[PDB]
Structure 1
Amino acid sequence: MSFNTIIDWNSCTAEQQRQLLMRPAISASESITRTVNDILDNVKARGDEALREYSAKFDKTTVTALKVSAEEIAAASERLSDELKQAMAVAVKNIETFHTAQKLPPVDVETQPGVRCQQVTRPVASVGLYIPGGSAPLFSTVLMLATPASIAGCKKVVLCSPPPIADEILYAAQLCGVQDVFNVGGAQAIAALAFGTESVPKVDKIFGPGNAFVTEAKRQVSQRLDGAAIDMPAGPSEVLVIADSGATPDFVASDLLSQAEHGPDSQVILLTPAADMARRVAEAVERQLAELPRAETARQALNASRLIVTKDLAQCVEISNQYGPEHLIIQTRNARELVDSITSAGSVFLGDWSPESAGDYASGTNHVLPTYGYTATCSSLGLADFQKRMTVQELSKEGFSALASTIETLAAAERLTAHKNAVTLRVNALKEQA
């Protein structure tokens, strides 16, 4: 249906092989940047009045109260089925158990007698969460963001989403303890969280992906001093599946399609030692695609897919590590054995019964992951992103005295007399006193 079939890796030239491992390039659109720039400055200078002006020309019912009332929340709540509410409770319980398990053990050591050094954590005081709106509300992200923030001890957690806000998002927010929910979206919401308005509190860090304007807004506020920090840069979503001859074509295909339906820009890749497996997966994908209700998105994403036949699993791992996929699914006989050799990936799924779908919703891991190659240096969203590491040290007189000569020597070597003098004064004071 307008596309490729399979690629024999070793049949490609060294150059072509390097072109596949590369991801598409993004523009900059001098226009969107300028548009977003004016949006941010406007929101900072004219607050809620400015937000209502945008709400006006962007809606048939200009928003009045920015903060969703507690009454509107309880109403949305009752309208959801018990089935769905219970499903969310299961997801939150497992997400909570996994992230709670990431709490850093205390770091407290005496590098040498009398020289006590510690590392303690402090939560980011206030965080803002953004959730896109629309037809199909991806309320699960609310669970992924608010849960870790709650566990970290963040003092303030607020959320913005394009009005009207779905009952699922509102319920997901209440369930995770989100304190305030605001009727704002796009680059304006990011600006509202980053700068603050009469209604929206200024937060220290903003979490949550969005469209091109949300992404640009997050980039801009992270680069401004009067702005705020952000969770991570965005990029197209990806999935790489490593499958041997023992995998089930339909399982492989269902995972490639799950990722593909996340957007026309999703990158889906299959690495398999078996040409036969590749062919079967390609056909399963075609057959399953034909049953997908609204598969135009999935269809377009598949045009950039790559079903690669390799020499063996070792070459599969070599290729995967060079790529560093956001999601890595290992459907091979010795799945867990390979993990150790996996040097780069956002989140790994092992075996036939670990669908990407299980991780997006209820296994407990976070589905907010690095993509577009950022897997090379950034990590999966976790507890650490809602905290800060602070260092503390205390030297006793004895500890200080034994380290003094070393400090003076080094300070003197760097020609920083005042640093050296700070030690000398203390040393003489100690001789004196006793």
Structure 2
Amino acid sequence: IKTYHLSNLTQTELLSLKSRPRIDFSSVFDIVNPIVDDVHAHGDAAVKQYTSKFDKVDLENIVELVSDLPDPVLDPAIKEAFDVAYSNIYAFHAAQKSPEKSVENMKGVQCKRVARSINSVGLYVPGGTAVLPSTALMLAVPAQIAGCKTIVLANPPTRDGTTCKEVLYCAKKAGVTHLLKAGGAQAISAMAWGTETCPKVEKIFGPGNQYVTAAKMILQNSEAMVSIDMPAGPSEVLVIADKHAIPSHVAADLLSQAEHGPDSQVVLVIAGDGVDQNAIQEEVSKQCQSLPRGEFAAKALSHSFIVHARDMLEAITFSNMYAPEHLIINVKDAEKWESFIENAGSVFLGSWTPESVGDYASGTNHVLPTYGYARMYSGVSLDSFLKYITVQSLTEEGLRKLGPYVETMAEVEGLEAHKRAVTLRLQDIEARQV
């Protein structure tokens, strides 16, 4: 409910706004380490125990090959909607391919950067009661485009043990190879180390909850030889609204984020004068009462806050400091403010572009950096699933011309074998002129 005016604040007060409520992950590591170690040591049996324990389901086989599962049949309207998403997500991400053009800054010194897919990747889509086929498209489409050979999707089952069929449809469309019917730390460990039946993966994506996230943090510093997309905290939106924003559409934007759960973070920034803060707030109350996830949204909004900025430059400056997962800019001429944005996972410009268009189908990626990590991490993209290999090839003339400079730098550095690798080659070359 809290309201702040940027003119009222000291440098110390600013800073407490920039930082999210502390999550002590050390605490969460203590809970997660035994689970990670158990799966590491005892494999599928251990995974089955934790799945029985936490998801209250007992599994025969925790992994299946997706190409052996039947094509599920969906309501045609539902199917077409996910085909549209797929199509837009596919096109946005395919357009991120780098051309691989060679640089020749001196004659005969040809260098280039080429993309190779990460061979094996693991994707975490939360499950049980959550039905998250959208996240499945977000992780698997760019994997598919990148060409990854093994694609493990981890998706904890419903209370009976049934795979969410929309997720499965999405997984089949994006070439997921393996479906791992587990969640939690236990699923992260199984992909990081591999098991009797779950392939070992080289990189793991999707933030899951704070327990998934902790295991990812832990396993990236372990011997498992696994990298992750990014660390994480709760989901967030920051909305900037000016007097041209419709109060009820602003309210709906706040609740759209709030309904993700009690820990979602909402920030309303009011840029300029003439905005009816009251109407927005009342409109939030009215809309919240009919939401089936209204209890979640209300718990979330109990630690939301409002910020008054006297102008749009101040609003954006505050948003840059904050570094929001999602940024909504509902102000006149929103597009013009783009070159002022420095830190945000994803940006929604104007009045017709709610967060859920990006959550589902605009084509951008919704697995975005939270907690302030947009300061140095990007949302998942095609490049998240590639390594770039640098290549250089010299001709004789190139080495003739570049070698001496190399000789010089190696001497300066005290590295004489580095020098001789070149000199010995130059001797051979000069020896073959008569």
Q: C-alpha displacement at 1:59, in angstroms? A: 5.7
Q: C-alpha displacement at 1:11, in angstroms? A: 2.8
In the aligned structure 2, how far is the partner of 1:140 from the partner of 1:95? Answer: 10
Q: C-alpha displacement at 1:266, in angstroms? A: 1.6
Matched AA of 1:307: I
In the aligned structure 1, how far is the partner of 2:132 from the partner of 2:151? Answer: 19
Name the counterpart of 1:172: 170
In the aligned structure 2, how far is the partner of 1:283 from the partner of 1:261? Answer: 17
In the aligned structure 2, how far is the partner of 1:256 from the partner of 1:57? Answer: 35
Matched AA of 2:25: A
Q: C-alpha displacement at 1:279, in angstroms? A: 2.8
Q: C-alpha displacement at 1:289, in angstroms? A: 1.3
Is the Cα contact below 8 Å between 1:73 and 1:167 reproduced in 2?
no
TM-score (norm 1): 0.94
Residues 1:115 and 2:113 aligned together: no
After superposition, give the CA deviation of every residue in 1:266-291 in whole Å (9 maximum; x if it has no partner): 22112121263333322221221122
Distance 1:19 1:66, change over 3 A: closer
Name the counterpart of 1:67: 63
Name the counterpart of 2:283: 284
Matched AA of 2:411: A
After superposition, give the CA deviation of every residue in 1:185-206 in whole Å (9 maximum; x if it has no partner): 2111111111111111111111
Is the Cα contact below 8 Å between 2:113 and 2:388 reproduced in 1?
yes
**Residue number among 4, 19, 23 corresponding to 2:20 in the alignment:** 23
Q: Which moved more, 1:20-29 or 1:363-372?
A: 20-29
Name the counterpart of 1:36: 32
Q: Which moved more, 1:203-212 or 1:276-285?
A: 276-285
Alignment of 1:297-308 (within 5 A): 297-308=296-307
In the aligned structure 1, how far is the partner of 2:143 from the partner of 2:368? Answer: 16
Q: Which moved more, 1:87-96 or 1:316-325?
A: 316-325
Name the counterpart of 2:96: 102
In the aligned structure 2, how far is the partner of 1:332 from the partner of 1:338? Answer: 9
Q: C-alpha displacement at 1:322, in angstroms? A: 1.3
Name the counterpart of 2:252: 254
Mind listing any 5+ residue stretches in structure 2 that lack a counterpart?
none
- SS of match in other structure, 2:204: strand
In the aligned structure 1, how far is the partner of 2:14 from the partner of 2:65? Answer: 55
Q: C-alpha displacement at 1:50, in angstroms? A: 2.3
Mind listing any 5+ residue stretches in structure 1 that lack a counterpart?
none
Q: Which moved more, 1:153-162 or 1:61-70?
A: 61-70
In the aligned structure 2, how far is the partner of 1:60 from the partner of 1:376? Answer: 39
Is the Cα contact below 8 Å between 2:67 and 2:177 reproduced in 1?
no
Distance 1:263 1:423, change over 3 A: same
Matched AA of 1:356: E
After superposition, give the CA deviation of every residue in 1:316-373 in whole Å (9 maximum; x if it has no partner): 1111111111111111111000001111111111111000010000000000011111
In the aligned structure 1, how far is the partner of 2:430 from the partner of 2:213? Answer: 61
**Residue number among 192, 195, 199 corresponding to 2:193 in the alignment:** 195
Query: How large is the Cα RMSD of the aligned pairs?
Result: 1.8
Distance 1:259 1:40, change over 3 A: same
Q: Which moved more, 1:100-109 or 1:41-50?
A: 41-50
In the aligned structure 1, how far is the partner of 2:372 from the partner of 2:430? Answer: 58
Distance 1:144 1:216, change over 3 A: same
Is the Cα contact below 8 Å between 1:127 and 1:203 reproduced in 2?
yes
In the aligned structure 2, how far is the partner of 1:99 from the partner of 1:36? Answer: 34
Name the counterpart of 1:332: 331
TM-score (norm 2): 0.94
In the aligned structure 2, how far is the partner of 1:27 from the partner of 1:292? Answer: 31
Name the counterpart of 1:295: 294
In the aligned structure 1, how far is the partner of 2:139 from the partner of 2:382? Answer: 10
Distance 1:59 1:27, change over 3 A: closer
- SS of match in other structure, 1:340: helix
In the aligned structure 1, how far is the partner of 2:104 from the partner of 2:68? Answer: 55
Name the counterpart of 1:219: 217
